[PDB]
Write a protein that binds this ligand. Structure first.
Ligand SMILES: O=C(O)CCCC[C@@H]1SC[C@@H]2NC(=O)N[C@@H]21
Ligand SMILES: O=C(O)CCCC[C@@H]1SC[C@@H]2NC(=O)N[C@@H]21
Ligand SMILES: O=C(O)CCCC[C@@H]1SC[C@@H]2NC(=O)N[C@@H]21
Ligand SMILES: O=C(O)CCCC[C@@H]1SC[C@@H]2NC(=O)N[C@@H]21
Lengths: 122, 122, 122, 122
């Protein structure tokens, strides 16, 4: 739900995700990573299912962060794909792909894959 | 500069990606999939490295599509992570994650992974 | 180490992994899944780094299970890629790819991606 | 029957995969990578569906290579998951996970993901 997703969330690495869920299915916010070649906040944009299934199914969503801001540029971008599970202890469970810009020769090793779990703070 | 990301692209499945890259790193556009539980166009939003390295590296980028529009709702979302390589034959090489909203018991098989290659040739 | 990997392990879904680490870097054993189109034990074979780095780095390994045994055939195969972290509480952290045999037309949705964490039992 | 998996295959990077498929589902052979921290041949072991569906589906399979041999040790392992499609131009289409042994603090970037297509044409 927009109100359920909107808020501040943190993942197991200590990174911060601040997001606003729009009525049209849009997600905008900022992300601050606790690891990597990153410093300060980065803009994020994404989309979510604004009319999810009325059962105990999660709400599918995804967002992207290109790691360039006014202080640093890592020449990479990460996309998180997952689902929001609301409730008393709402969590957003994701898997992500982090691609670095590389020359053609090194393209085979351009993408890392991982998973992050986010917990919402009050 | 010289980032011919803006335009209409097609992937190996025949899906159509129409995007506009903003000078500050935003990607906005529509996606029409030739496969899956989809019909017509869907809104996409993403981010890209607006200041890539000056060596022969590609430009990292990523975008998301929540598969809900006025015609259908598949209760899923896809994120594409990859890089743009320009020149005579430009391409956007990506790997994607498609997550469907599931119940807790089916969460283990909620995500599909694949790769798409886009060109401006139909 | 072979002795550290050898044993019975269980993951968060309740599946059982029984493996033997060979001196030559081989892994053989059986796997019993708590979910999916599976019943009883399946043969698994894999490889691991038998001469890992002497620091607090994990030992890289991987294994495969084709989901066909004498009782059932799911026409799929899963490969787990990860690292073994030994100690008092040794764990094997992995990410996996599960591919189903499909017709060419449905190949785009043939592979699921996920992650499993295994705990060793005494 | 009619599974021409046994043989020498090459992927788009020029790597060589030599495998023997056993009547009961085992895959054994050697791998020589054209890229990465590798030299010469490495042992691989895997599994495949020895009784695939009788519809036009591919045969699911997977294999692992731990990158240690008498010449080098990269302290990593790769697992390829995919399916074999036979006919005039047979192919093995795969997605892979390459995990490097890391320390706990770098575990988040321990795994690379990519895709390789193998053909019997050099
Ligand atoms: O190093 C880079 O290329 C940019 C920073 C990457 C940080 C990654 S994104 C996925 C994972 N989850 C996080 O919170 N941070 C790391
Ligand atoms: O079936 C669904 O859940 C929605 C449509 C999914 C279409 C996918 S997204 C990745 C791949 N690339 C495409 O162009 N289409 C498929
Ligand atoms: O349903 C199938 O196609 C065969 C069974 C798949 C079980 C999967 S493998 C990855 C995940 N981890 C497990 O322990 N079981 C599921
Ligand atoms: O660099 C390493 O850690 C060992 C060599 C990795 C080679 C990889 S495995 C996936 C991809 N496919 C290949 O044929 N080679 C690269």
């Amino acid at each position: 739900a927009e109100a359920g997703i909107t808020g501040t969330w943190y993942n197991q690495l200590g990174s911060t995700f601040i997001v606003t869920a729009g009525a049209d299915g849009a997600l905008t916010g900022t992300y601050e990573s606790a690891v990597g070649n990153a410093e300060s906040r980065y803009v994020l944009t994404g989309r979510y299912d604004s009319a999810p299934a009325t059962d105990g199914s999660g709400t599918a969503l995804g967002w992207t962060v290109a790691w360039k801001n006014n202080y640093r540029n890592a020449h990479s971008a990460t996309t998180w794909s997952g689902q929001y599970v609301g409730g008393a202890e709402a969590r957003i469970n994701t898997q992500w792909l982090l691609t670095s810009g590389t020359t053609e020769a090194n393209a085979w090793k351009s993408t890392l894959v991982g998973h992050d779990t986010f917990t919402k703070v009050k």
